């Protein structure tokens, strides 16, 4: 079996938010529901990471490190994909029962949070990203940041990361494809990968603010609260190296 076919079979099942559409909407209600959904998506992301070939060979501390650094990148990218596949309209499809439409976008402070996530879906649409490219790109996002002083299994990590870069290359070549157009496409997809650091920076600013300001009464489930608590000191101590394809 090919490497991309193994990434495909471990794709998590779509989760429902359990959002009651008969009750009126509010920004607070949507944010709260999404944090609970995020916690369940993150538990499924751990099971997913464990089945990625090579991931389990890294030191356990590195496995934890990579999931903690990349969690928001993984969530926003998968959301970008679901939004891109559902429609060609400017919609965020968090779950099949929780889609942020134009009427929902008009709720106080909905748009300023949603614009960074809408950028991901609009880019996947503009670049006409394939399912195989997507699968390779999402695994690369798990491998997109490391500690300032590196991982315990740094050498093995670099080898695994290079393998998934070559795997993204193989997905691009399937369309079908011109040598010059291949390098152009590789450049474009890696540029989108790089821009995920900027999308995530913007999303974490809202995430960290709503987690820390207890007077906002915005709840996060245990899975997300634990990751956020771990990550906030790492950002304040500059303990992060954001890997880039383009300098």
């Amino acid at each position: 079996p090919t490497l991309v076919s193994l990434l495909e079979v471990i794709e998590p099942e779509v989760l429902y938010a359990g959002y009651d559409s008969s009750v009126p909407d509010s920004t607070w209600r949507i944010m709260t529901t999404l944090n609970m959904l995020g916690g369940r998506q993150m538990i499924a992301a751990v099971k997913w990471a464990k089945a990625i070939p090579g991931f389990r060979n890294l030191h356990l501390d590195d496995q934890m490190t990579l999931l903690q650094y990349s969690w928001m990148s993984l969530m926003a990218f998968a959301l970008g994909w679901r939004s891109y596949r559902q429609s060609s309209a400017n919609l965020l499809c968090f779950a099949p029962d929780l889609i942020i439409n134009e009427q929902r976008m008009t709720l106080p402070d909905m748009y300023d949070q949603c614009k960074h996530m809408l950028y991901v879906s609009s880019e996947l649409h503009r670049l006409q990203v394939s399912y195989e490219e997507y699968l390779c790109m999402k695994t690369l996002l798990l491998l997109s940041s490391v500690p300032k002083d590196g991982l315990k299994s740094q050498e093995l990590f670099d080898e695994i990361r290079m393998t998934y870069i070559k795997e993204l290359g193989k997905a691009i070549v399937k369309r079908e494809g011109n040598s010059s157009q291949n390098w152009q496409r590789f450049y474009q997809l890696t540029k989108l990968l790089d821009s995920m650091h900027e999308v995530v920076e913007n999303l974490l600013n809202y995430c960290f603010q709503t987690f820390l300001d207890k007077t906002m009464s915005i709840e996060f489930p245990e899975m997300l609260a634990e990751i956020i608590t771990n990550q906030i000191p790492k950002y304040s101590n500059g303990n992060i190296k954001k890997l880039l394809f383009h300098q």
Binding site: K50, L60, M64, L67, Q68, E222, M223, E226, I227, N230
Partner: peptide
């Protein structure tokens, strides 16, 4: 401590 994450990584599945 990251109790939940370590548990999910160490448990079977």
């Amino acid at each position: 401590e990251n109790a939940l994450l370590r548990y999910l990584l160490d448990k079977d599945d």
